[PDB]
Design an enzyme around this catalytic site. Sequence first.
Site, PDB file in Angstrom:
ATOM      1  N   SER A 167       1.089  -0.904  -0.103  1.00  0.00           N
ATOM      2  CA  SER A 167       0.440   0.076  -0.021  1.00  0.00           C
ATOM      3  C   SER A 167       1.013   1.205   0.257  1.00  0.00           C
ATOM      4  O   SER A 167       1.451   0.900  -0.636  1.00  0.00           O
ATOM      5  CB  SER A 167      -1.294  -0.315   1.289  1.00  0.00           C
ATOM      6  OG  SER A 167      -1.482   1.413   1.455  1.00  0.00           O
ATOM      7  N   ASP A 201      -8.154  -4.985  -6.417  1.00  0.00           N
ATOM      8  CA  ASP A 201      -7.949  -3.989  -6.047  1.00  0.00           C
ATOM      9  C   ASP A 201      -8.997  -2.653  -6.322  1.00  0.00           C
ATOM     10  O   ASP A 201      -7.980  -1.764  -7.305  1.00  0.00           O
ATOM     11  CB  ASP A 201      -5.933  -3.943  -5.503  1.00  0.00           C
ATOM     12  CG  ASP A 201      -5.631  -3.183  -4.604  1.00  0.00           C
ATOM     13  OD1 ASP A 201      -6.461  -1.736  -4.288  1.00  0.00           O
ATOM     14  OD2 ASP A 201      -4.298  -2.698  -4.404  1.00  0.00           O
ATOM     15  N   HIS A 257      -6.304  -5.571  -1.888  1.00  0.00           N
ATOM     16  CA  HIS A 257      -5.854  -4.699  -1.676  1.00  0.00           C
ATOM     17  C   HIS A 257      -5.088  -5.206  -0.825  1.00  0.00           C
ATOM     18  O   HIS A 257      -4.853  -5.282   1.168  1.00  0.00           O
ATOM     19  CB  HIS A 257      -6.491  -3.253  -0.970  1.00  0.00           C
ATOM     20  CG  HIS A 257      -5.790  -2.673  -0.813  1.00  0.00           C
ATOM     21  ND1 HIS A 257      -4.499  -1.621  -1.640  1.00  0.00           N
ATOM     22  CD2 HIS A 257      -4.851  -1.659   0.868  1.00  0.00           C
ATOM     23  CE1 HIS A 257      -3.750  -0.863  -1.216  1.00  0.00           C
ATOM     24  NE2 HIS A 257      -3.913  -1.001   0.097  1.00  0.00           N
TER      25      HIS A 257
END
Length: 508
Positions: free
Chosen positions: A166, A377, A417
């Site tokens: 991330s 994602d 994600h």
Amino acid sequence: DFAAKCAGFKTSLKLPNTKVWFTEHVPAGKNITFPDNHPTCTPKSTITDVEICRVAMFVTTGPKSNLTLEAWLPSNWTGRFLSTGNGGMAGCIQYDDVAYGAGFGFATVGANNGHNGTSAVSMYKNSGVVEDYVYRSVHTGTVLGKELTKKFYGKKHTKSYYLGCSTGGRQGWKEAQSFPDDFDGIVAGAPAMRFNGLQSRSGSFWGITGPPGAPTHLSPEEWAMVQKNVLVQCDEPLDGVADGILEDPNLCQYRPEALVCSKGQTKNCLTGPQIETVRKVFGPLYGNNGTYIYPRIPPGADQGFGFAIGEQPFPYSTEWFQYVIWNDTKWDPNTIGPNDYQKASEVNPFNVETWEGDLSKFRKRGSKIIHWHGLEDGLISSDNSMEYYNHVSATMGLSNTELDEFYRYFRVSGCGHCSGGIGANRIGNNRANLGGKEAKNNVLLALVKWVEEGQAPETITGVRYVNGATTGKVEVERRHCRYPYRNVWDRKGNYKNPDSWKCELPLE
Ligand SMILES: *[C@@H]1O[C@H](CO)[C@@H](O[C@@H]2O[C@H](CO)[C@@H](O[C@@H]3O[C@H](CO[C@H]4O[C@H](CO)[C@@H](O)[C@H](O[C@H]5O[C@H](CO)[C@@H](O)[C@H](O)[C@@H]5O)[C@@H]4O)[C@@H](O)[C@H](O)[C@@H]3O)[C@H](O)[C@H]2NC(C)=O)[C@H](O)[C@H]1NC(C)=O
Ligand SMILES: *[C@@H]1O[C@H](CO)[C@@H](O[C@@H]2O[C@H](CO)[C@@H](O[C@@H]3O[C@H](CO)[C@@H](O)[C@H](O)[C@@H]3O)[C@H](O)[C@H]2NC(C)=O)[C@H](O)[C@H]1NC(C)=O
Ligand SMILES: *[C@@H]1O[C@H](CO)[C@@H](O[C@@H]2O[C@H](CO)[C@@H](O[C@@H]3O[C@H](CO)[C@@H](O)[C@H](O)[C@@H]3O)[C@H](O)[C@H]2NC(C)=O)[C@H](O)[C@H]1NC(C)=O
Ligand SMILES: *[C@@H]1O[C@H](CO)[C@@H](O)[C@H](O)[C@H]1NC(C)=O
Ligand SMILES: [Ca+2]
């Protein structure tokens, strides 16, 4: 003995601008709690798999800015140094990743990005706190981490590694671009690179949809309807396998007019304004003078979709524009537009954008980077990672075959994600998304084998256990392809089997 070394290391370790709070012996299997963490931070506790010496430090970086660095040094040390990253706007040390690293024998470190808690309110009227968030926290942690690792074991590290997801992926790329000498190996997952464009992108969805009740807004049920219709148009027709997973979202150009409202008013259909909203959400963001800001959210990207697009405005983007870009708490996310996207690019604190194509220094010294992104994602667009690969290829004047030497970007189908998703997602970037413990099916071990044994990863294998469990019998397994290859089903074998799929890049 190890316990005596760890206790005495407190007083002897005098690093510059660094105050050692304590040194703690932590045996294998012990549960370590984190009471001094912010209420918003996660995790609250972690189980260490091996015996370690947990060092805790306070690093002053400026007049009104500072870090909290921790170094977990194992007794069965392999020689390898590791550094972890952060997530979102958070000043949370990712303790699970630090323990995950320690489990494989790495001298692992992790810092809090220059503040405490998930909020970015610390950044308001404070350049030093932003400077730590953008680059200096991870860099300072790496330099100090090597010195204490050298002083503790009485010998320098063999190889230096990074693991992040991330925001951590952006932090890993910041290192590859601007601090190439820090790491020999880097894993950059779901990177928040083109960061000002990402906050512009994430902020724009509220401006597009509006609040609930408005004609442009879609409810969670209506978005769930759209994602089902995406699979009808793009799943089996484009990859031949009806598994709810788009193997290559580049081929899918979704049309929401298939669900147009024939009725007088809406029920389970898209109105004219709702059709306009879906095309903007599944379309690129442009701004003033026709400048390009950020790509679409790809169709099928359902994982982490509700956070950015929901009943209230997205907090991370709002705080970014309020505290960092405009420097005003009165800034309204309801009236977001081109002028805000332009201002974020012009301000760009400490080059947080992280969109540098020239990786010459990183290549020259012989460092490797594994880049990866989940195709489900919905919080950060996987199309952004595709565009970075091509930006690097175009900037450096190097083909995909030349980039294979040092830089490989893997597209993980059916993965959300950082963790989650409904496909063969467990690739070993962290504990939450942990599958096997081999080079072929663990990206951290794949990075080690590439740097040390020269085994470049052709694919990275992901897995799904039965009933989407943490461990057990393997239900689905697929070898995820590096860009620009495409994973193609052979039209005969079982789609759950790895051997039925093949990575293809047509040249004739
Ligand atoms: C809110 O407050 C902040 C300050 O706290 C203001 O931020 C400044 O914004 C101005 C523009 O309004 C910027 O000034 C520009 O600087 C340019 C020079 O290059 C910088 O910006 C580049 C972006 O294209 C960036 O790539 C570059 O990075 C390099 O230097 C960094 C150190 O400075 C280093 O860490 C990187 O690794 C890299 O080497 C530079 O930062 C120049 O070309 C422009 O003409 C213009 O002068 C400032 O840079 C901003 N400073 C900071 C700290 O963010 C902001 O404007 C305020 N907003 C309002 C509305 O008041
Ligand atoms: C490691 O230590 C921590 C802290 O002692 C342990 O965390 C605690 O775990 C218990 C469950 O065993 C949690 O209780 C449960 O909390 C939830 C959420 O509030 C609630 O719904 C349940 O009814 C139950 O009360 C407790 O909250 C939790 N505390 C903290 C601070 O995290 C952890 O279990 C230990 N790990 C291992 C493997 O033993
Ligand atoms: C941000 O959060 C971190 C924790 O993630 C805070 O670190 C903690 O800081 C306190 C000092 O405020 C430390 O307390 C000290 O403990 C030692 C050892 O018992 C003692 O000798 C000192 O007198 C003091 O009480 C604590 O050790 C430390 N914890 C860790 C894990 O590093 C940090 O202070 C926070 N920073 C800000 C600006 O809020
Ligand atoms: C650390 O920085 C924060 C602001 O980011 C400040 O509140 C605090 O006083 C600082 N602490 C020290 C010891 O300098
Ligand atoms: Ca499919």
